[PDB]
Design a protein around this ligand. Structure first.
Ligand SMILES: OC[C@H]1O[C@@H](O[C@H]2[C@H](O)[C@@H](O)[C@H](O)O[C@@H]2CO)[C@H](O)[C@@H](O)[C@H]1O
Ligand SMILES: OC[C@H]1O[C@@H](O[C@H]2[C@H](O)[C@@H](O)[C@H](O)O[C@@H]2CO)[C@H](O)[C@@H](O)[C@H]1O
Ligand SMILES: [Cl-]
Ligand SMILES: [Hg+2]
Ligand SMILES: [Hg+2]
Ligand SMILES: [Hg+2]
Ligand SMILES: [Hg+2]
Ligand SMILES: [Hg+2]
Ligand SMILES: [Hg+2]
Ligand SMILES: [Hg+2]
Ligand SMILES: [Hg+2]
Ligand SMILES: [Hg+2]
Lengths: 162, 163
């Protein structure tokens, strides 16, 4: 089960950080469900797993990304021999959804980032903020700044044609 | 008329970049008016000028910041001898105003940043983006990222005492 799962209030409608999490997968455990949340990006930090959507089964490993979007019927499962760990960021809002439409990643909902990608670092930085989250110290501003950085980095690394 | 004056559409209501500008003052000249815009932060990059608000007269120079807020009756004028250049960023939105009210400088509306302040660099970066603004290249995302960075840096350097 998950070592970290932070849920935030839905207070913003243009851009909102909904949740984040870290899960070390267990062999023989996966999830099979219709996505209820707006958008959830997963980054694979260790091991191996499968992501299945619309009859396509992807074998993913460290460096891979998969994104869940509202209404998708998905199945994602840790490998038996070497189960993955993933980090995730769930987010919503009218700006978020417009920016997701500017990246090719929402075509297949899977990507592989380069070893020098800013995407992993932003997700990890957002998770660190989540651990000691304090809006009185304006951690709410920092999280939203990082979410804008994350969506910019997805468009930069996985652009749609101009 | 100005080195830069980019005006943006009011498309966001929580956080919006309204405008960006760079102006080289003409000696002895400036502006005297009631502020109509939501919030406009100015950073003095060169020279000297005067900012007058609510019976106070500030003699500002490079490193100084002044902020214009809706309803303020202001006058700001370049010095006769060595007229200032300033950069500005106008912004609006419900969350923008909440964040601005976590700073100590919404009454005085004038500050001096430390020489290692992130504030000057963010404003400069926003002006550079504004010069070749292209939403097709997602410059709109970059400007909002920088506005969050700017409000975070203002709160870090000018924190309202929290209880
Ligand atoms: O949201 C990412 C998170 O999803 C969990 O699965 C949940 C999902 O969050 C929830 O909306 C739905 O009702 O039930 C699912 C459990 O079946 C995963 O457990 C977690 O690892 C992340 O992938
Ligand atoms: O907004 C900062 C910008 O203000 C200009 O002054 C304008 C102002 O923007 C406008 O709202 C008002 O109706 O007219 C003013 C001119 O009287 C300054 O010219 C410019 O240098 C910036 O300070
Ligand atoms: Cl100020
Ligand atoms: Hg897809
Ligand atoms: Hg990667
Ligand atoms: Hg987070
Ligand atoms: Hg995270
Ligand atoms: Hg997290
Ligand atoms: Hg700008
Ligand atoms: Hg003021
Ligand atoms: Hg300064
Ligand atoms: Hg600017």
């Amino acid at each position: 089960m998950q070592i970290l799962w932070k849920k935030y209030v839905k207070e913003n409608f243009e851009m909102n950080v909904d949740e984040c999490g870290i899960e070390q997968g267990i062999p023989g455990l996966g999830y099979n469900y219709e996505v209820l949340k707006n958008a959830v990006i997963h980054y694979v930090t260790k091991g191996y797993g499968t992501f299945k959507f619309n009859g396509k089964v992807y074998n993913l490993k460290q460096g891979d990304i998969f994104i869940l979007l509202k209404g998708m019927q998905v199945e994602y499962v840790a490998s038996i021999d070497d189960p993955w760990e993933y980090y995730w960021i769930g987010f919503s809002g009218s700006n978020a959804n417009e920016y997701l439409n500017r990246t090719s990643i929402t075509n297949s909902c899977v990507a592989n980032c380069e070893e020098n990608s800013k995407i992993p670092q932003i997700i990890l930085n957002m998770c660190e903020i989540s651990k000691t989250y304090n809006p009185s110290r304006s951690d709410d501003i920092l999280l939203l700044k990082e979410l804008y950085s994350l969506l910019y980095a997805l468009i930069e690394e996985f652009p749609k044609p101009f």
